Amino acid sequence: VMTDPIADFLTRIRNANMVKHETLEVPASKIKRDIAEILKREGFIRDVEYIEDDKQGVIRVFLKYGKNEERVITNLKRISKPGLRAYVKADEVPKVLNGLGIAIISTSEGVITDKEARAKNIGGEVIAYVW
Amino acid sequence: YIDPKHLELEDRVVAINRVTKVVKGGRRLRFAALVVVGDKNGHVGFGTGKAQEVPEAIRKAIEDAKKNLVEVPMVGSTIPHEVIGVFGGGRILMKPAVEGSGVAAGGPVRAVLELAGVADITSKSLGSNTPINVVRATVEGLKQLKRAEEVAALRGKSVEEII
Amino acid sequence: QDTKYEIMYIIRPNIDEEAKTALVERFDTILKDNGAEVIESKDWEKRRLAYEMNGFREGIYHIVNVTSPSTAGAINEFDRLAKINDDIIRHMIVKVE
Amino acid sequence: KVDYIAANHIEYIDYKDTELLKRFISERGKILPRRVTGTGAKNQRKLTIAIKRARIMGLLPFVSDE
Amino acid sequence: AISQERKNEIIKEYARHEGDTGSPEVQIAVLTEDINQLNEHARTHKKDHHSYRGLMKKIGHRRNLLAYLRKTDIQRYRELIQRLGLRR
Amino acid sequence: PTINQLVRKPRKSKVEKSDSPALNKGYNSFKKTQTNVNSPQKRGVCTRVGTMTPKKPNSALRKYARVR
RNA sequence: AAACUGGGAGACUUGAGUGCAGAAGAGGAGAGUGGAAUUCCAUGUGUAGCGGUGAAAUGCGUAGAUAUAUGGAGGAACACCAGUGGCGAAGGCGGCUCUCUGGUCUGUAACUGACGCUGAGGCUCGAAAGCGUGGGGAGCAAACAGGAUUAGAUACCCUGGUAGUCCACGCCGUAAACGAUGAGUGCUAAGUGUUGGAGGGUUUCCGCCCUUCAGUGCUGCAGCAAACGCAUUAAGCACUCCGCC
Numbered sequence: 001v002m003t004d005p006i007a008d009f010l011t012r013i014r015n016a017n018m019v020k021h022e023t024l025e026v027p028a029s030k031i032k033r034d035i036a037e038i039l040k041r042e043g044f045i046r047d048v049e050y051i052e053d054d055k056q057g058v059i060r061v062f063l064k065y066g067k068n069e070e071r072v073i074t075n076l077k078r079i080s081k082p083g084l085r086a087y088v089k090a091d092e093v094p095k096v097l098n099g100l101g102i103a104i105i106s107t108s109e110g111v112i113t114d115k116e117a118r119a120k121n122i123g124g125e126v127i128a129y130v131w
Numbered sequence: 132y133i134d135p136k137h138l139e140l141e142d143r144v145v146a147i148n149r150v151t152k153v154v155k156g157g158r159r160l161r162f163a164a165l166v167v168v169g170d171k172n173g174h175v176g177f178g179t180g181k182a183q184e185v186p187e188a189i190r191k192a193i194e195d196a197k198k199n200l201v202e203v204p205m206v207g208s209t210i211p212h213e214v215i216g217v218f219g220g221g222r223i224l225m226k227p228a229v230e231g232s233g234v235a236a237g238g239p240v241r242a243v244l245e246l247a248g249v250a251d252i253t254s255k256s257l258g259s260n261t262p263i264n265v266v267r268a269t270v271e272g273l274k275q276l277k278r279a280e281e282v283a284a285l286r287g288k289s290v291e292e293i294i
Numbered sequence: 295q296d297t298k299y300e301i302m303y304i305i306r307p308n309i310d311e312e313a314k315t316a317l318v319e320r321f322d323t324i325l326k327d328n329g330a331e332v333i334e335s336k337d338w339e340k341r342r343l344a345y346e347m348n349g350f351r352e353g354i355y356h357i358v359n360v361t362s363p364s365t366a367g368a369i370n371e372f373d374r375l376a377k378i379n380d381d382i383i384r385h386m387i388v389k390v391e
Numbered sequence: 392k393v394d395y396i397a398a399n400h401i402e403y404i405d406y407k408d409t410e411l412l413k414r415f416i417s418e419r420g421k422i423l424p425r426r427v428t429g430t431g432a433k434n435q436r437k438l439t440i441a442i443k444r445a446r447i448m449g450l451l452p453f454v455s456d457e
Numbered sequence: 458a459i460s461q462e463r464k465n466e467i468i469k470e471y472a473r474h475e476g477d478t479g480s481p482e483v484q485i486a487v488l489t490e491d492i493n494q495l496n497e498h499a500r501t502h503k504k505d506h507h508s509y510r511g512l513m514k515k516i517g518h519r520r521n522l523l524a525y526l527r528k529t530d531i532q533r534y535r536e537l538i539q540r541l542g543l544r545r
Numbered sequence: 546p547t548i549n550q551l552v553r554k555p556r557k558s559k560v561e562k563s564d565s566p567a568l569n570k571g572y573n574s575f576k577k578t579q580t581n582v583n584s585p586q587k588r589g590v591c592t593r594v595g596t597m598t599p600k601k602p603n604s605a606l607r608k609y610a611r612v613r
Numbered sequence: 614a615a616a617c618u619g620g621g622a623g624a625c626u627u628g629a630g631u632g633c634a635g636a637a638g639a640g641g642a643g644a645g646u647g648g649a650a651u652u653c654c655a656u657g658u659g660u661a662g663c664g665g666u667g668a669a670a671u672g673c674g675u676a677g678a679u680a681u682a683u684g685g686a687g688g689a690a691c692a693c694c695a696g697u698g699g700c701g702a703a704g705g706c707g708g709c710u711c712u713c714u715g716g717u718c719u720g721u722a723a724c725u726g727a728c729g730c731u732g733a734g735g736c737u738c739g740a741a742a743g744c745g746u747g748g749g750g751a752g753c754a755a756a757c758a759g760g761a762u763u764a765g766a767u768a769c770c771c772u773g774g775u776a777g778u779c780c781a782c783g784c785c786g787u788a789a790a791c792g793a794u795g796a797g798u799g800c801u802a803a804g805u806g807u808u809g810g811a812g813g814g815u816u817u818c819c820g821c822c823c824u825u826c827a828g829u830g831c832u833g834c835a836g837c838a839a840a841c842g843c844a845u846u847a848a849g850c851a852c853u854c855c856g857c858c
Contacts, residue, residue, distance in 0.1 A: 019835065019836095081853095343449040345648085398820095514716090518630085
């Protein structure tokens with residue numbers, strides 16, 4: 001049975017990225033929509049459109065490719081897992097790939113990037129690394 | 132692409148190997164050579180060749196070694212970020228280092244690293260130590276190094292926005 | 295509901311034409327006394343056989359058509375009486391649908 | 392090669408119509424495969440039960456030489 | 458094993474509203490009828506190990522639905538388990 | 546393992562042993578023999594002397610003693 | 614402070630179950646029954662061999678063998694069908710009829726409203742051989758006897774032959790018990806066979822084309838692997854829980 005919908009979302013993105021085609025659909029959720037917006041703001045996704053009929057979903061993602069069809073996201077990783085949770089303090093916020101990648105952190109004032117958190121000096125649960 | 136072999140290149144032997152083939156009667160013996168090639172400015176290639184004597188072998192290997200070359204980016208004598216290169220049972224981790232610290236790296240990987248002009252870097256081999264596969268894994272890990280400009284170009288951003 | 299069967303037996307060839315009626319009526323009765331609604335009973339044909347059964351190479355075929363609830367002790371009574379007779383040679387009881 | 396039980400739309404087999412059954416047995420009495428007769432997978436199961444039923448009730452020979 | 462008239466006979470008295478085939482009352486009552494009949498069959502045919510598997514799986518299903526009913530409404534639970542005659 | 550299996554039953558490593566075990570000794574004077582007192586050397590009295598022949602493929606007569 | 618994990622009051626239908634309408638099957642337990650063949654028995658005809666091997670011999674036979682014809686008695690296994698077919702959690706399950714009974718698949722959209730997954734300790738089942746009590750005993754056959762072969766042959770080969778192999782009830786609890794591949798769930802090119810269903814078209818389509826569920830095989834891409842290889846039935850990409858090095 002499904003136990004980690006955030007990990008399922010991340011693996012859909014990675015699986016459809018590696019085979020290099022240009023759409024993807026998932027059942028919706030308040031957290032996945034948050035990280036879809038964060039993925040859109042930084043430049044990994046091209047767009048995101050919200051359909052909704054009679055159950056939770058859905059969310060459509062439009063991937064993005066280089067000028068010679070090379071990939072802008074190269075991998076993607078789930079950090080906190082149901083079974084071993086990872087909490088970070090305001091001075092422990094991580095810097096993935098020397099700033100060339102982002103981390104995603106949930107705090108008392110939103111689900112935000114790792115820059116926006118070490119500018120506010122808070123910490124929380126660590127969702128993912130995307131580099 | 133092809134970095135074409137038209138430069139000032141300082142080669143280096145990394146290994147040799149007495150290799151046989153049993154035939155009717157007795158035994159044949161050749162010599163296999165492993166060589167690196169570079170200019171200590173950021174272009175490094177490896178190549179191997181075999182012959183019946185050691186000079187002929189090392190020659191054919193430098194011949195082979197020059198046909199391949201990699202770009203090896205860096206940001207002031209230090210690799211841009213941290214990579215792990217894996218190729219068939221050889222795992223090699225590489226980290227950015229501090230200014231004037233040197234190269235702390237093992238036998239095969241330090242040849243590769245020094246002939247590309249790397250000055251300050253730390254390494255470790257979490258794998259097997261067969262020279263060929265160590266060299267191949269190291270080159271496999273340099274190819275993952277990303278420039279700061281290219282990332283800013285691929286995304287819709289500028290630099291000094293993501294650093 | 296009920297279940298439907300088809301009983302098919304083989305009478306001895308060399309009997310007369312009154313013991314035959316006696317036998318047919320006898321088994322109709324002893325089917326019905328246990329709550330087995332008989333709904334057809336006919337003669338079929340006189341045939342020779344593809345091998346001799348006891349010493350006989352002909353026999354007269356008779357078929358009946360009967361329903362009953364699946365638990366009634368009727369259709370086993372037919373078996374228990376038929377394998378001890380002297381004019382019947384074989385029988386096959388079979389669920390019909 | 393067409394399934395002759397599908398030629399007509401025949402629903403029941405009845406193990407009694409030894410005229411229909413007699414075309415699925417060889418010239419010695421043995422059952423013929425699903426290939427040499429081109430019938431289906433389940434009609435073959437029904438036909439086999441039919442002729443096994445027939446042989447017991449003395450409508451059909453087990454072996455036939457004498 | 459129960460017929461299709463016994464089944465509707467006993468789901469027309471543990472229903473709550475009309476059209477009520479769900480509702481863990483209905484399910485544990487019908488499962489109880491099944492487990493009784495299968496216990497009879499096992500006593501008669503006690504080396505039918507392949508039907509005992511199904512018996513045990515029915516028992517597991519009923520115990521699970523009972524746990525659910527209890528954890529959400531104790532009143533319905535007590536009233537049922539009085540009405541149906543179990544909880545030894 | 547899952548980290549729940551690890552929490553139920555932790556990791557255990559191997560135990561190392563010397564190759565000079567008769568050099569962690571204890572007296573036999575008042576009660577018994579005590580093992581805490583790792584020594585660099587011990588002394589004794591030789592109860593025999595002589596020679597012996599080595600393994601394969603060496604060849605000699607190597608001098609030795611037995612000591613209490 | 615209030616995003617996430619935990620607690621409390623609610624609400625929902627996609628997971629999970631139930632109802633209604635259908636389908637396939639060597640799934641299991643009990644009780645009867647059929648034909649082919651082997652053995653022994655009875656009777657007729659019948660003359661000197663039969664049987665067996667790389668060659669022979671032991672064995673059976675002129676108290677009439679083998680062969681051949683007709684009749685009886687008993688036991689065990691089910692030819693053709695039969696198929697990389699079907700069913701079962703595994704061990705396993707093949708003649709036929711009836712009685713009692715477990716699970717799976719497909720459509721629908723009445724219903725309940727997260728009732729789910731995994732599972733240390735514990736229980737249940739578990740090929741063959743073996744053990745106990747009482748039956749049965751045709752063929753085969755450890756042990757054993759006799760004949761051969763060899764340097765020897767407490768073997769392989771031939772003639773015999775006891776437990777056992779079979780039934781009822783108890784015990785045992787192990788196998789290369791194997792796909793040497795734990796269970797649940799989602800995602801990731803294509804091509805081609807076959808088993809059981811459901812839809813649309815042309816419509817004697819009931820034989821053909823297309824779509825779609827669940828099984829079962831072959832080839833092959835990304836990716837993985839130390840190579841062999843695996844590849845929507847993963848040994849790929851990921852999360853949960855157990856067993857083990």
